Design a protein around this ligand. Structure first.
Ligand SMILES: CN(Cc1cc([C@H](CC(=O)O)c2ccc3c(c2)nnn3C)ccc1Cl)S(C)(=O)=O
Ligand SMILES: [Cl-]
Length: 289
C-alpha cells in the first residue's frame, strides 16, 4: 500500500502503540492502540487488513506470552480479535503465502517451538503444518517465489546461523546454506531474488552487518552494514527499499529508522520513531480513515 505500520514493541515494558509512517512526506500518525500490549510480535498484511501475531506482554503485573491474532482495519481504525493460534509464540516470525499467514517458532515460557501453523482468513482458522527441523525463537521469516524461509534465531541453547525452507506442496522443511553470521532477532525480508538478514544478536554483541541469500546461487553475501548495530529490529520493504525500525544496540532502545538502497549499496537515516523501542511488528498497507 502506502504506509509503514509499526505495532507494539518494548521499552521498559511491552507497548500498545500502533503508528504509521509515510515515506512520501516523512509524517507519523498515531492510530488505535492494540487491545493488549505486546513485544516480540510480528506484523503482516493480507487483503488490506493488518495482522498482529503472537508476542508477549512483559508488564509489572506479570508476563504473558501471546497466542493472539488481532485484525486491524485501516478503513475503520479498529482492532478486532481474530482466531488465536494453537500455542503462545513470543519472538515469533511470520510469512504470507497465497493469502495465508504462517506463524513460525517463537517461545512459550522455556518452550522453544519448532512448530509452524497456517491461518486462513476466509475461514478464520489456524492449522498446524510440518514443524521446522530446528527450534527457533527470534526467527527471521521471509517469502520468495511462494516458498517460506526461517532464518537464524535461538534454539534454547545456541544462537543460530542456520536457515531452512518450507515447500508447501510437499509440506516439508529442508535446510538451506547457513548464513555467514550467527543472528538471533535479525530483521529478515525479501528484495528482488534475495533474502536479506540485517542485524541481530549472537549472544555477545548486537550486529550492524547485513547479508543476503540468492536463491539461484544458494550463497550468502554481505552488503553494506547498517549505520546502527541492532537486535530485535522491525523490517519491511516499501517501494524496492528495505526499512529497518528500532531495536536494541546494547545501550539504547533505538528510535532510528534506516533505509537501504540496493542500487547504491547504502544505508541512510530516514526518520525517527516517536520513541525508542525494540521487538516491534511491522508491515505495509493503505493509509487509514
Ligand atoms: C528484545 N526483544 C525480544 C527478542 C529477543 C531476541 C534474542 C533472543 C535470544 O537470542 O536469546 C535476544 C536476547 C537477548 C538480547 C538480544 C536479543 N539483544 N540484546 N540482548 C541482551 C530476539 C528477538 C526478540 Cl523480538 S523485545 C523484549 O524487545 O521484544
Ligand atoms: Cl521477551
Amino acid at each position: 500500500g502506502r504506509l509503514i505500520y509499526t505495532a507494539g514493541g518494548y521499552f521498559r515494558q511491552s507497548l500498545s502503540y500502533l503508528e504509521a509512517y509515510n515515506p512520501s512526506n516523512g509524517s507519523w500518525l498515531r492510530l488505535a492502540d492494540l487491545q493488549v500490549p505486546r513485544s516480540g510480535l510480528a506484523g503482516c498484511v493480507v487483503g488490506g487488513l493488518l495482522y498482529a501475531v503472537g508476542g508477549r506482554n512483559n508488564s509489572p503485573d506479570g508476563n504473558t506470552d501471546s497466542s493472539a491474532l488481532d485484525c486491524y482495519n485501516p478503513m475503520t481504525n479498529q482492532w478486532s480479535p481474530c482466531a488465536s493460534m494453537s500455542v503462545p509464540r513470543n519472538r515469533i516470525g511470520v510469512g504470507v503465502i497465497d493469502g495465508h499467514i504462517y506463524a513460525v517458532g517463537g517461545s512459550h515460557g522455556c518452550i522453544h517451538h519448532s512448530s509452524v501453523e497456517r491461518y486462513e482468513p476466509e475461514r478464520d482458522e489456524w492449522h498446524l503444518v510440518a514443524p521446522m527441523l530446528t527450534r527457533r525463537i527470534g526467527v527471521g521469516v521471509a517469502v520468495l517465489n511462494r516458498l517460506l524461509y526461517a532464518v537464524g534465531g535461538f534454539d534454547g541453547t545456541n544462537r543460530l546461523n542456520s536457515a531452512e525452507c518450507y515447500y508447501p506442496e510437499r509440506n516439508e522443511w529442508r535446510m538451506i546454506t547457513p548464513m555467514n553470521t550467527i543472528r538471533s532477532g535479525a530483521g529478515v525480508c525479501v528484495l528482488h531474488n534475495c533474502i536479506y538478514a540485517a542485524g541481530g544478536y549472537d549472544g555477545q554483541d548486537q550486529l550492524n552487518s547485513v547479508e543476503r541469500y540468492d536463491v539461484e546461487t544458494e550463497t550468502w553475501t554481505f552488503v553494506a552494514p547498517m549505520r546502527h548495530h541492532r537486535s530485535a529490529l522491525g523490517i519491511t520493504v516499501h517501494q524496492g527499499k528495505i526499512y529497518v525500525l528500532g531495536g536494541y544496540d546494547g545501550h539504547t532502545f533505538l528510535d532510528s529508522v534506516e533505509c537501504y538502497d540496493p542500487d547504491s549499496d547504502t544505508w541512510s537515516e530516514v526518520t525517527r520513531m516517536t520513541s525508542g523501542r525494540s521487538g516491534v511488528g511491522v508491515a505495509v498497507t493503505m493509509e487509514p480513515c
